Amino acid sequence: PRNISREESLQLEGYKHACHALLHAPSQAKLFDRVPIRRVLLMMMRFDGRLGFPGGFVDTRDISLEEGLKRELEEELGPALATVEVTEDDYRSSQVREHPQKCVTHFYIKELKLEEIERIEAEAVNAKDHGLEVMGLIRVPLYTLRDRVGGLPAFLCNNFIGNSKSQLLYALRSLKLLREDQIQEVLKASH
Amino acid sequence: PRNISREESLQLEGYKHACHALLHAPSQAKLFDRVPIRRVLLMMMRFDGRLGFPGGFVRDISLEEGLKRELEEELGPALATVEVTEDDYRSSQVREHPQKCVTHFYIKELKLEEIERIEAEAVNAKDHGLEVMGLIRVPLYTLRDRVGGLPAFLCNNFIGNSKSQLLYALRSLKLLREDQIQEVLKASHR
Ligand SMILES: [Mn+2]
Ligand SMILES: [Mn+2]
Ligand SMILES: [Mn+2]
Ligand SMILES: [Mn+2]
Ligand SMILES: [Mn+2]
């Protein structure tokens, strides 16, 4: 609920802040040699059985949003994230809420080279959080299959830690991956 | 949709055969140093956006042999040493609401390190980023809120009947009693 500015969200007192990031990379691959993958988007299965974007809570009195994100990404995704600088330019949006708890979440979006994502996936099994906070990394299917369900629509029927779905739908729009009509279709096909 | 025998299946006309496996290993690890993992159970995100177990379609070789082939393709080269024998066979179902289909479910215990190596090398499998969008571990615990963990996990999208197969494994491996399973299901669909 509510799109707040970064600058205004940061000026608030007694709010709990969170940072999450969509890491992505272009791909020339085709599923079954016919269906283009287009782009690789990382999400993860969380300890709580829900899908989410990597990241977490940041205490903005101690460290910066970016520094907090950085530290959270390393724990969740592993060493490979020491070559990766998610900076202010990667920042995208911020939502604020007061119930259940005064919470602001920030959303980042960073493009990488395909092999970087691959190095990340290869090394995520060595992350401090593997098999604990993080139950596994997954790629988001951007395609719809011949049955009009399989792929993205079906994927959106999984269980998402509150708000991550909306962030994802935001990112599909912002990266020009899907038209508004296409997103609407994907949501109907899902239901 | 319907329970069946291995011999009533393998001697059926028409129908296409499928094999999937739960690979699992014990674990002493603790979430937030508090909540026991108990056991590591592999599943995966499929290309179709659904969760399922690794495996697939088998007049060919044999149920064990096909499963091995699919597991190698989907999990990587590490699998070639995993036994996956008749001793690891468990059950068979018959559906007909999407062409005559027989699913054969397998459960095999490995060593934790074996599961770990499987995860690490899965990214080099033929099917990584194609048929296989990533491996996951099944959370077996339930968090303070009485939803997070297994109950919330059961609200994800499962490819036909894999959920049923999972719930069986929880009973079969004595991880949860019947009432416990019904509790997580009640919490899940609530
Ligand atoms: Mn975290
Ligand atoms: Mn997190
Ligand atoms: Mn396969
Ligand atoms: Mn398969
Ligand atoms: Mn196959």
Q: Tell me the C-alpha distance between A75 and A71, whole Å.
A: 6
Look up residue B14 and give its DSSP letter. Answer: S
Phi/psi region, residue B76 (left: phi>0; alpha: psi -120 to 50; beta: rest), is left
Contact list in A for residue B156 (CB cut-off 8 A) is: 49, 51, 158-159
Strand-strand pairing, A134-139 and A103-111: unpaired
Contact list in A for residue B138 (CB cut-off 8 A) is: 135
CA distances to B54, B61, B63 from B102, rounded to whole Å, are 16, 16, 11
- b/e per residue A69-91 (b: at least 16 CB within 10 A): bbbbbbbbbbebbeebebeeebb
Measured over all CA atoms, what is the biggest interatomic distance in chain A, rounded to whole angstroms? Answer: 53
* Interchain CB distance below 8 Å, A49 and B157: no
Q: Compute the distance from residue A57 Cα to the ligand 1 centre, in Å.
A: 7
Looking at the DSSP assignment, which residues form a beta bridge with residue A27? A38
Taking Cα atoms as reference points, which of A62, A47, A73, A40 lies closest to residue A136? A47
Look up residue A90 and give its DSSP letter. Answer: G
HSE (side-chain half, CA atoms, 13 Å) at B77: 2
Range of the domain at A109: 1-191
Show the DSSP H helices in B11-111 as ranges.
63-75
Residue B3 · residue B91 · CB < 8 Å? yes
Write phi, then psi, for B11 (nearest 5 degrees).
Answer: -105, 15
Tell me which method was used to determine the 3D structure: X-ray
Residue A160 · residue B49 · CB < 8 Å? no
Q: Which residues of A touch B (CB under 8 A)?
A: 27, 29, 31-32, 37, 40, 45, 47-51, 118, 121-122, 125-126, 130-133, 135-141, 145, 150-159
Tell me the structure's resolution in angstroms, rounded to a single decimal.
Answer: 2.6
Task: Provide the Cα torsion B34, B38, B40, B43; round to 10°.
Answer: -90
Residues near A100 by beta carbon (within 8 Å), at least 6 away in sequence: none
From A49, A125, A153, residue closest to B119, measured CB to CB: A125
The response to whether A17 counts as a known ligand-binding position is: no
Q: Tell me the C-alpha distance between B70 and B54, whole Å.
A: 8
Give A107-165 as a 3 state SS string: EEEEECCHHHHHHHHHHHHHCCCECCCEEEEEECCCCECCCCCCEHHHHCCCCECCCHH
Q: What is the CATH number of the domain that holds B65?
A: 3.90.79.10
Residue A68 · residue A76 · CB < 8 Å? no
Write phi, then psi, for B75 (nearest 5 degrees).
Answer: -105, -20
Please write down the long-range contacts of A111-116, taking CB distance under 8 Å and 24 or more positions apart.
Answer: A111/A24, A111/A25, A112/A23, A112/A24, A112/A25, A112/A84, A113/A25, A114/A25, A114/A26, A114/A27, A114/A40, A116/A25, A116/A80, A116/A83, A116/A84
> Coil, strand or helix: which one is A190?
helix
CA distances to A44, A161, A177, B147 from A51, rounded to whole Å, are 6, 6, 20, 15
Q: Is the dihedral of CA B82, B85, B87, B93 positive or negative?
A: positive
Residue B34 · residue B144 · CB < 8 Å? no
Residues near B135 by beta carbon (within 8 Å), at least 6 away in sequence: A136, B42, B43, B44, B75, B118, B119, B122
Chain-centre distance of CA A121, in angstroms?
Answer: 15
Strand-strand pairing, B89-95 and A103-111: unpaired
Domain total in chain A: 1
Contact list in B for residue A75 (CB cut-off 8 A) is: none
